[PDB]
Nucleic acid binder design. Structure first.
Length: 97
DNA sequence: CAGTCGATCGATAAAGGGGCCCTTTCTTAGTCGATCGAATTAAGGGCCCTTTAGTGTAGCGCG
């Protein structure tokens, strides 16, 4: 990832492995909260071409799950990891979202 | 070969979704804001509390 293992504790290394865990298990849900500047969102954006960082969180249901107008699947059918940044403000216009 | 394609390129009404108004309640406090309670202020004002005069009695000047 670009991290120095010798400068990190074993527990922090295991937390970093738990960061990669979503990439390796099908349909793996996980939530992480931390102080700003702890490098949470680095891996989901820069360290893999198989993950997406849906910024803001205000992404629509048709975009994310399924758009009947085009009958084409949303994000979850395409990327192996979908990471919602700034979970505080994430909101769906449609109530069923 | 010239007849005459089946893909193409125009429309002109659909359900879904984006969006962006947008208005519209809907609160949310900012300032009323005139009211009303209660609590000051006083000024008034009715009112209870003192002196005087006139009646029955003991001392004392006196014809």
């Amino acid at each position: 990832i670009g991290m120095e293992p010798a400068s990190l504790k074993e527990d922090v290394q295991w937390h970093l492995l738990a960061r990669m865990v979503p990439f390796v298990e099908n349909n793996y849900n996980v939530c992480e909260l931390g102080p700003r500047g702890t490098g949470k969102s680095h891996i989901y954006k820069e360290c893999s071409p198989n993950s997406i960082l849906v910024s803001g969180g205000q992404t629509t249901v048709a975009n994310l799950f399924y758009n009947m107008s085009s009958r084409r699947i949303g994000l979850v059918g395409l990327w192996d990891v979908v990471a919602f940044d700034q979970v505080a403000g994430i909101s769906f216009k449609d109530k069923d979202g």
